[PDB]
Amino acid sequence: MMEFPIAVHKDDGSVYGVTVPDIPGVHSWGETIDDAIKNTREAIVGHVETLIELGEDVEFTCSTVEELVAKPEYAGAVWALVSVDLSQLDSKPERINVSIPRFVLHKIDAYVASRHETRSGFLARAALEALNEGKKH
């Protein structure tokens, strides 16, 4: 849910070009492969931030290299994996009130203390995991 395969193309006289198939519309580039990977993460962040700002739906799948590698539009591409937490990209989140069982809350607080996460960050990530599972299983 936080890791996205990227497809890297390269022609004789071209730069490296990047497609992120799981987030529709995202593309990037680099002079070198290391630059292309670095740029791609910034392009994802910017694209999703723009969606959020415009109040558009942020729709994204989570694919493995293997399920993408054979598609004709990626023929001859090479692959890498970019890590972006999309749940951290809203600068104006909504404050809500929720009832959490005490035993659940104690487990959350213990888990996030070591990882320096917040309750809100934990819950948003967990919500996205559960919605992705609710789409297949």
């Binding site: 730069v15 519309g25 593309h27 740029n39 910017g46």
Partner: protein, 60 residues
């Protein structure tokens, strides 16, 4: 159509409007087709494969 400048121009002539920029990433919206299209702008030739993907997203 592999030059990023020519490509952006082709998008613009199709009605795509630049709404935001993140470094070299140019984010485009269309008033009559759905979705956001992110186009890299190195001012150089992009590979044909990434060009075709951009064309597909833009309905070009």
């Amino acid at each position: 159509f592999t030059n990023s400048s020519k490509l952006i121009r082709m998008l613009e002539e199709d009605g795509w409007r630049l709404v935001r920029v993140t470094g070299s990433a140019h984010h485009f919206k269309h008033p009559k087709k759905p979705g956001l299209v992110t186009v890299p702008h190195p001012k150089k030739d992009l590979p044909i494969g990434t060009v075709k993907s951009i064309q597909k997203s833009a309905g070009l």
